[PDB]
Chain A
Amino acid sequence: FVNQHLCGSHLVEALYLVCGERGFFYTPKA
């Protein structure tokens, strides 16, 4: 599911699935 164009909620969803209990940071401007 990670090998494609992922934008907005699609990207955040992938980060969530991939990072698990580590969590993540989402920085669309940085």
Chain B
Amino acid sequence: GIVEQCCTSICSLYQLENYCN
């Protein structure tokens, strides 16, 4: 999930936007 993608590893705008409504 987001923690694995952005916390444990380096985040990206692409991934963050996957979590916008």
Contacts and interface: CB of A to CB of B under 8 A. Distances in A.
Interface of A: 2-8, 11, 14-15, 18-19, 22-30
Interface of B: 1-3, 6-13, 16-17, 19-21
Contacts of A27: 1-2, 19
Contacts, number: 62
Contacts of A25: 19, 21
Contact of A2 (B3, B9, B13, B21): B13
Given A11-B6, A27-B1, A19 B11 contact: no
6 contacts: A5-B7, A5-B11, A11-B2, A11-B6, A19-B21, A25-B21
